[PDB]
Amino acid sequence: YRYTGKLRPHYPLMPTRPVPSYIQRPDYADHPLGMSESEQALKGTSQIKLLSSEDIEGMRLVCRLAREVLDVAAGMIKPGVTTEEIDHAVHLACIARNCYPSPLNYYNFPKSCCTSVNEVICHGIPDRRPLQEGDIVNVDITLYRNGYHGDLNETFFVGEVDDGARKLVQTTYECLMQAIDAVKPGVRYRELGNIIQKHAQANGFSVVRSYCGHGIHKLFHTAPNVPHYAKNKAVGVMKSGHVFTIEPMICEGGWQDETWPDGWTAVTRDGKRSAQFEHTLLVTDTGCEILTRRLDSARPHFMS
Numbered sequence: 001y002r003y004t005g006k007l008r009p010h011y012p013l014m015p016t017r018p019v020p021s022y023i024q025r026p027d028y029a030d031h032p033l034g035m036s037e038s039e040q041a042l043k044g045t046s047q048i049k050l051l052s053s054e055d056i057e058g059m060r061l062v063c064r065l066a067r068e069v070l071d072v073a074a075g076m077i078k079p080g081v082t083t084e085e086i087d088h089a090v091h092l093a094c095i096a097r098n099c100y101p102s103p104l105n106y107y108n109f110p111k112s113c114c115t116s117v118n119e120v121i122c123h124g125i126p127d128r129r130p131l132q133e134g135d136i137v138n139v140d141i142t143l144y145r146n147g148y149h150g151d152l153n154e155t156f157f158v159g160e161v162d163d164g165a166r167k168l169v170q171t172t173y174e175c176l177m178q179a180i181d182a183v184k185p186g187v188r189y190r191e192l193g194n195i196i197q198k199h200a201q202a203n204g205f206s207v208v209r210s211y212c213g214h215g216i217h218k219l220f221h222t223a224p225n226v227p228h229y230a231k232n233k234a235v236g237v238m239k240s241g242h243v244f245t246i247e248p249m250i251c252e253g254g255w256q257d258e259t260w261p262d263g264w265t266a267v268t269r270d271g272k273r274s275a276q277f278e279h280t281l282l283v284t285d286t287g288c289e290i291l292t293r294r295l296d297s298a299r300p301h302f303m304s
């Protein structure tokens, strides 16, 4: 395998971390290949759940707890900290909140969060590599509580970064917030990628095509499929009571991705950097609510 950039996997991985049996588990947690029978059944259906008041309470809760976990991770980002150390802290934080860390054994993913450095687009595997000054790193959190999944991510700066890194991360966060600003009943899911690509292109960046936003609730990934690029052919119209993610991945060079031999880590084919942000959204009569919002701070972590 020809690595596309400087980054390499740093093995061995610490042994798999267990989740106490007192924590409720999603179906895939105990499937040998990590398959979700509940997802595979609804595969091919493009209808979107209208959440009950009860489902909404369940999503507010898990999304609040997932934000608390991301904030734990954010406090650890500096040179010399390994991504495995971040994951271990995340895993304990989930357990402390009576939550299962959704990524763990999702299609056999080996860790409890995804940590994506520099040319990693998404799904990076926490490992023994110490973070270096100048790195950008995304931590992607998803929790499972009382039957509901809540999903968010942010990109962080590792010490001082270059102007390029600042512009990439800022634009990506802007792409996400412009998409969010367009969400309200009667907007087509396919329109969000028009707004995202328009802002990325204006700043000289490209938009990943291979990975999309998703419906989330009782399933980790379900309808709708939410592409981040322009002139996609997503099916569906937003209605009050729909929950889904927007999670744009923006690249310094081309949009093309490829996967490492580990089967998970997605990287730019050109080796240039990629950044990502994600929120879980509830569509309301007036617009949308950001379920994974910060409660105690106006801005994302990179802004400080």
Ligand SMILES: COc1cccc(Cn2ccc3cc(C(=O)NO)cnc32)c1
Pocket: 102, 103, 106, 107, 109, 114, 123, 140, 151, 247, 263, 264, 265, 278
């Ligand atoms: C075999 O196919 C693959 C390849 C890579 C990853 C995985 C599975 N998986 C693990 C966790 C995980 C997190 C997200 C997420 O939505 N963040 O917003 C998505 N997929 C995920 C499967």
Ligand SMILES: [Co+2]
Pocket: 140, 141, 142, 151, 152, 153, 247, 278
């Ligand atoms: Co996520």
Ligand SMILES: [Co+2]
Pocket: 151, 213, 214, 245, 247, 278
């Ligand atoms: Co997601």
Ligand SMILES: [Mg+2]
Pocket: 010, 129
């Ligand atoms: Mg090394």
Ligand code: NA
Pocket: 116, 117, 118, 119, 120, 121, 122, 136, 138, 273, 274, 275
């Ligand atoms: Na990256």
